[PDB]
Amino acid sequence: KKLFLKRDNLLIADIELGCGNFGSVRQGVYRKQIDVAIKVLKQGTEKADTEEMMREAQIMHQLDNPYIVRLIGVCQAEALMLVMEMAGGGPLHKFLVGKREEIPVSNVAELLHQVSMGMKYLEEKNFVHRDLAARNVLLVNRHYAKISDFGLSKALGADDSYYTARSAGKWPLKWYAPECINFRKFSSRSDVWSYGVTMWEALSYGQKPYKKMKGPEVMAFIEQGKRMECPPECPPELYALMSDCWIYKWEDRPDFLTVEQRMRACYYSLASKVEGHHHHHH
């Protein structure tokens, strides 16, 4: 619990990166002066919400990976605040919109590959993210992606899954595996399903999943043995991969150990056909 920071080393700018009911995420700097994102709990917060962020803060402290937003520490001042590294690029989906001629598929597969490495790591640490989606993948730059928002993250321990309570609000159904909707059961393979939707979102350059559907309109679809089409120009090997990520039976769905290895091959294949180059994570 040496994770507390000095309010004085933190300058919070009047810049909001995102928001929501929990409060807002703002940009600032922390002492040289590293850029940081600050999750500030709403002013009128409650024990429950303060405990959650506190648990969230605790989970992030256990994670040490390049493809995951790092926790700088927690700061208790005029409000409870989660201070974590900054990913200036922003969300993967808003980033890819209208950029099919700027960001080739090889670059998209690069970012998706990095995400698969982060999740492989998460799986090993037996943590379930639950909210993996393009909007929660943040870019440091165009060749460096990071998984963020561990607000719904949870440790599994010896268990390979858990049944969650139902909190007020709506569920991002289009990103949930069948067993998540029918039995509220979550696991790594559940994150794999979300990873598959994430691949689709990215490979389709920012489009919304099941665009035109909503609610039980989606589950009925999946139930019948149907899924999203192959995005335009997405290589067969990639689609075969995201498709396998949508295997109904939990037991028959690949784990991140296999997804990463498969995503790695699909990526290096494309990358080996590109002209020019960039650097490591840059």
From Swiss-Prot:
<comment type="subunit">
    <text>Interacts with CD247/CD3Z; this interaction docks ZAP70 at the stimulated TCR. Interacts with NFAM1. Interacts with adapter protein SLA; this interaction negatively regulates T-cell receptor signaling. Interacts with FCRL3. Interacts with VAV1. Interacts with CBL; this interaction promotes ubiquitination, internalization and subsequent degradation of CD247/CD3Z. Identified in a complex with CBL and UBE2L3. Interacts with SHB. Interacts with adapter protein SLA2; this interaction negatively regulates T-cell receptor signaling. Interacts with CBLB.</text>
</comment>
<comment type="function">
    <text>Tyrosine kinase that plays an essential role in regulation of the adaptive immune response. Regulates motility, adhesion and cytokine expression of mature T-cells, as well as thymocyte development. Also contributes to the development and activation of primary B-lymphocytes. When antigen presenting cells (APC) activate T-cell receptor (TCR), a serie of phosphorylations lead to the recruitment of ZAP70 to the doubly phosphorylated TCR component CD247/CD3Z through ITAM motif at the plasma membrane.</text>
</comment>
<protein>
    <recommendedName>
        <fullName>Tyrosine-protein kinase ZAP-70</fullName>
    </recommendedName>
</protein>
<feature type="modified residue" description="Phosphotyrosine">
    <location>
        <position position="163"/>
    </location>
</feature>
<feature type="binding site">
    <location>
        <position position="39"/>
    </location>
    <ligand>
        <name>ATP</name>
    </ligand>
</feature>
<feature type="domain" description="Protein kinase">
    <location>
        <begin position="11"/>
        <end position="270"/>
    </location>
</feature>
<feature type="binding site">
    <location>
        <begin position="18"/>
        <end position="25"/>
    </location>
    <ligand>
        <name>ATP</name>
    </ligand>
</feature>
<feature type="active site" description="Proton acceptor">
    <location>
        <position position="131"/>
    </location>
</feature>
<comment type="similarity">
    <text>Belongs to the protein kinase superfamily. Tyr protein kinase family. SYK/ZAP-70 subfamily.</text>
</comment>
<feature type="cross-link" description="Glycyl lysine isopeptide (Lys-Gly) (interchain with G-Cter in ubiquitin)">
    <location>
        <position position="214"/>
    </location>
</feature>
<feature type="modified residue" description="Phosphotyrosine">
    <location>
        <position position="162"/>
    </location>
</feature>
<feature type="modified residue" description="N6-acetyllysine">
    <location>
        <position position="273"/>
    </location>
</feature>
